[PDB]
Design a protein around this ligand. Sequence first.
Ligand SMILES: [Mg+2]
Ligand SMILES: [Mg+2]
Lengths: 56, 456, 456
Amino acid sequence: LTDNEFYQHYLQNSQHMMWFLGAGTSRSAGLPTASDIIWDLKHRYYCLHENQDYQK
Amino acid sequence: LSQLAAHSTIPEPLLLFKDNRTDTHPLRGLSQYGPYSACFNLPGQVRLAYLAPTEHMRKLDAIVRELQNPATPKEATNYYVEYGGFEKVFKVPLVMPQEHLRCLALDECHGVAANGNGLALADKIVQSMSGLFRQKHAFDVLLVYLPASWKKCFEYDGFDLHDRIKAKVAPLNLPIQIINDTALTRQCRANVMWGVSVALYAKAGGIPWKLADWDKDEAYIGLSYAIKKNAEGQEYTTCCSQVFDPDGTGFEFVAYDTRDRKGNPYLSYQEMQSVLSKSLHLYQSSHNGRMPRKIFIHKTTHFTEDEIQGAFDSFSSSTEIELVQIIQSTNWYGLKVDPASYPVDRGLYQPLTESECLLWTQGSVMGVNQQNPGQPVFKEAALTPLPNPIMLRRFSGNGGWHATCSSILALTKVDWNNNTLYKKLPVTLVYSQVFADVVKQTPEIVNEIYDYRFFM
Amino acid sequence: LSQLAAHSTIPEPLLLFKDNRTDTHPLRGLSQYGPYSACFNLPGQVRLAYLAPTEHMRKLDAIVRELQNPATPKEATNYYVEYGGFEKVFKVPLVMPQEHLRCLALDECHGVAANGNGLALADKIVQSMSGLFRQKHAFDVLLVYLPASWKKCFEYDGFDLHDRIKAKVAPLNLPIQIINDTALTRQCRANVMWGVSVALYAKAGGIPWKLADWDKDEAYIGLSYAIKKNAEGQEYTTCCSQVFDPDGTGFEFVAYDTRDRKGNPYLSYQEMQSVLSKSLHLYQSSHNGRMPRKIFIHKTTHFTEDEIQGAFDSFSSSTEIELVQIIQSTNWYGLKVDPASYPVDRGLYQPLTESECLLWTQGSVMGVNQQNPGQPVFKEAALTPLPNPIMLRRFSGNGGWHATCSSILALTKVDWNNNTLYKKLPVTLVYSQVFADVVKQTPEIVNEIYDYRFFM
DNA sequence: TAACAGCTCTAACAGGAATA
RNA sequence: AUUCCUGUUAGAGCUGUUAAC
Ligand SMILES: [Mg+2]
Ligand SMILES: [Mg+2]
């Protein structure tokens, strides 16, 4: 289904439309994604045991 | 009580190639992707000249000619990949030298071969190559050939022929790749061809490979020494080396003397702070003037109390100094059990005590072997049956075995002069040793710092 | 109805120099005090290198000697100041290269130039640099000379040799000061000497002068584009430059790409948001994470709705954004009356419409006249008899024409590559345009960001 | 999508030097 | 390309306003 036909279909019947937004919209909201969270956790974990400066 | 601290196996470091296509195995990556500097086209075409006695001239042509043809390995086939020639593998044409560039060793050298005078032979060879001083732009790499008949002056007490020749030629700024009968003799042709091809490409100015995802803000210093057997006492020649990565894409590798007389290999406060300040200025010059956020120092012997303070007083607070001593001779040795059919994995480091760890720089590596795919490869299976773990003694690092262990493991893979998978020591240590030999042979080098491409 | 809003002349911005002294005349201050960055030792000494054909190297050493010795201004003596000698004025020795720090271009470059192939000529010039690359630590700045015989490849359609060379040597970290025959045959000598010397100091170290009265909490952004004429259509390559004064003393001036294909010079929502994200992330890295409070995005063309929405949504509410558009060619032009002999004082801004203002980046400047002190000076007197103002069409702001106008005026004076007193456009726009030309010539540069000293 | 109007920009050249 | 931007010759890019398709 081409995007334009989808837009026309949605506009035709927009009064009955659930939305489903999981972890994909948050990427563009200025908040870290799943991969960013994973990398942050890895950063804390590595800096903690192997004593390394966090902000360096 | 038979329980030791949990060992951690550092993964095999990756090497950077053309179009930043990473690979652990250097020669295979060179075949598949090409040299790292191929994208920059820094060497362009490679133009090389000869300097040998005419009675062996043809030999040089032959090997150079055979540099331009494919070769299939017969020895160490478990590791070496099929050679494709300089034109194909390095994406660079190999230029046949013209008669104007080609030189002949002056006749009196042969005569002094009978006299057994190494200094005279080296000076005569330099004067033979003096015909190439004016035509420095025409050629990039010189191929000096020393016949087996000169073996009497090859090595003797207090003198090293290749060392003296390179020490004489380096201030003139023209690389040589000395070729002896060994390179011709050697059965497996692909081994020697990989060696000479990589050596020539790197001596021209290109970079065959670089450490993948290497930090540009860390400089890895390495200090070594050499013995000169003086008539009255001993002489210790200490020289340093740096393998940092500048803000550009290429990476640097420069050694220099630490200097008037030393009877012990331990740098004092003044000398150590001076060499470290020179190293700091060298690093600053490349990175526009930015401080190195972390400094690694690999010394073959332990750091003195004054020497540690000398290392500290040379840098600011932001710099992190991890003084490390590398020990090659240890009573420990490891056996891998799951009893593994292949020796203990390379990079497996075992923390023995606070500020003392065992690193297995030597060992089996996964996925590198070509024949029988999916099996470990032991590079030194010919010499030793089992690997010998080196030992790190920490002196200054605040914390973390991973930083030093991974840094050293990755550093043992960027020796272009080496045509095998890795080394026993980081390139800093081996190049500091080589330059220590060079300086010990020739005292009039202490003033200037030199790149790795000259003495490699 | 003929009485417009009262204007106010922003005074000449002060420039931070040696020992934090301020002087609105750049060259006079440099002679009197010295470079701002000379307070610290970022450049230890300006070591140079030469790359030219064997025939024209004498021009390079002659011009270097001319830089060594003082010179007097012959043309435009109204503004220029007598050269005091590089060592005296920049307080740093200028080192002439030795034999090995002085390379020779391949003779194949002449053949390529006769063939009229710009790409291969640039490649050959870059490949000639290997002799210096073996000694990259030795020198700081390389003076590449191009003989007039290569004019056929200097500039033609779909190509520019200067941009290709700059983009080829930018990832190799070596600054390059290209010298044409024009710099040799320019009538005056102090002109060329001042320009070349300030460029050499900026490329070896940095910051010949820094703008004073600069809030550390403002990051200034300038977008500019260029056109690559495709056979089928066109490609609009737009790039963004950024200036800011960080917490450290080193004022920062960078540029970067914006990524695929663009048919128009107006960024979409996603591209504008991505570029702005990269910008404030760079600022945060240079400000230990502190959020910028004022953002100025100067664009040569009007911001669409998408660009303004991307600006609004990329930052938080605490950081007010000053979206301003700069119009170069305008119908308006003014004449000062008390009628004055010299045109209107530089920096006068005249609010025409609630969103559109005239800014006089060109005009008479007070207090920088060498002869007959007190007389005004018009920088573009030779080119134009009257100053053509620019139009600032604010697309987003809270209040205050003075805030943006003074920032633009101060940003028009920190172009170290500019020999003259000021620039018609802010350094953000000019550097974004220069980098746009570079990227248009070499599309494979979008990966990295670069400091000003590489491309100025 | 095809013209037409304006506003503004860059892309190639050429080009002379700070109130005389 | 030490610089500066003054013009010339062109084309695009946006806006529009119509006619459509
Ligand atoms: Mg060798
Ligand atoms: Mg320049």
